[PDB]
Structure 1
Amino acid sequence: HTDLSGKVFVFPRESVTDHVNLITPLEKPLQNFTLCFRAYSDLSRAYSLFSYNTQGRDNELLVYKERVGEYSLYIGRHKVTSKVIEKFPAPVHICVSWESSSGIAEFWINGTPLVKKGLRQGYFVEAQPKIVLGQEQDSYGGKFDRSQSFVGEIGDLYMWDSVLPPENILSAYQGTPLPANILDWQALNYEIRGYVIIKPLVWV
């Protein structure tokens, strides 16, 4: 595992090929979770930000940006969509949390709460995943789509197994995130495939 503090993945071109595979020791199905990251991209079209897929289950947990100012979370095939006023193009902090008990999805865009939505209440998101940046999975770790590929910069990725409160969300955005127990940027297990470069984060 690597300390990626002050660095970002750069997905420098539109492709069916460039991705980073995120390795996790998660053997337990997910009930609660929070996911945080920082994105910079000037893509007009729809792209995937974070693709989490299990065997036989496509789109198990997916953060997808369908268009400017519109953020989508997919749990177990089902989706929710929340809107927001945002400048284009701009760097963005994104935190999404979901909760099996309440079904509640919680988007935070730059430490600002989006409208809460709800999906898949009681659903247990399956374990032993394949997580990928830069590409949207249609298979277990494969079947990428070019017109869905991410091009731009991603960093400060943290993933917890619990619903973070507003303070802790604001902590991540302000630059001091609680040590995360599923995916931790400062101790990250990644695999680069194709054209992706690690560079200093300068748009912060």
Structure 2
Amino acid sequence: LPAGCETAILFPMRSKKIFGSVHPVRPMRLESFSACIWVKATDVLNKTILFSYGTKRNPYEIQLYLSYQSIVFVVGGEENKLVAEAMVSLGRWTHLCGTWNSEEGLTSLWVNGELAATTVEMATGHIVPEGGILQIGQEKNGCCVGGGFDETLAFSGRLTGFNIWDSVLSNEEIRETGGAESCHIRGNIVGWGVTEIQPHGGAQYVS
């Protein structure tokens, strides 16, 4: 387990059926936010969508994915994105965090409690609309067609601590969530064990 957790998803095999359905309880109102996460990637491709919140008219409303030895940060749509280079590789628990603002379009990334990317005037004044759904480990593809889901974009590996925050996280708290006692640090939008998480098609906890 990454730092002090005892539970983690297993994702033993990426196939055309592995996915999950999360049903958060509270609104997604966000003109700014931050999202720490610990990840253990087994294989990284040019395109492998770890998750993406999508609306009926904007499936790419939120998304981040690893492009070989790089990390992509998609906001709002495919066109608007931020990328850092050569930080994520196969098989190691690594803390990923970031921040965004709509006032002057400020956004940033924080790995291991340490900066990874930053820019300004992106998604300035943007507000995420509701009505979409957040999906983990898969992109929009067939589910019950004897497979269907893109095994290419599917994921295999260990994950734990699915959390989301309603506002920006200070650099101090980002560092703390990058520390060895980050398992108990959870956000309010989503908290591990607090938010409804429904693995499917292979994603197994290792509690």
Between the aligned residues of both structures, percent identity stands at 22
**Which residue in 2 is equivalent to 1:137?**
140
CA offsets 1:85-128 (integer angstroms, 9 cap, x no match): 45644221111222222322211111111130342111111123
Count, aligned residues: 192
User: Superposed, which structure 2 residues align to 1:45-84 within 5 Å?
Assistant: 45=45, 46-68=47-69, 70-77=70-77, 78-84=80-86
Give, in whole Å, the separation in 2 of the partners of 1:144 and 1:59: 17
CA offsets 1:37-74 (integer angstroms, 9 cap, x no match): 11112203131222111221111111211122x11111
Name the SS for the 2:81 alignment partner.
strand
**Which residue in 1 is equivalent to 2:97?**
95
Q: Give 1:186 shift.
A: 3.8
Name the SS for the 1:171 alignment partner.
helix
Structure 1 residues 173 and 186, CA gap change in structure 2 (3 angstroms): farther
Structure 1 residues 115 and 183, CA gap change in structure 2 (3 angstroms): same
Q: Does 1:107 align with 2:113?
A: no
CA offsets 1:152-190 (integer angstroms, 9 cap, x no match): 111122211111011111121222454421100142311
Give, in whole Å, the separation in 2 of the partners of 1:90 and 1:178: 20
- Structure 2, unmatched stretches of 5+, are 143-147
Q: Give 1:28 shift.
A: 4.5
- Structure 1, unmatched stretches of 5+, are none
- Taking structure 2 as the reference length, the TM-score comes to 0.82
Give, in whole Å, the separation in 2 of the partners of 1:138 and 1:108: 30
Following TM superposition, the consecutive aligned residue runs of length 4 or more in structure 1 with deviations greater than 6 angstroms are none
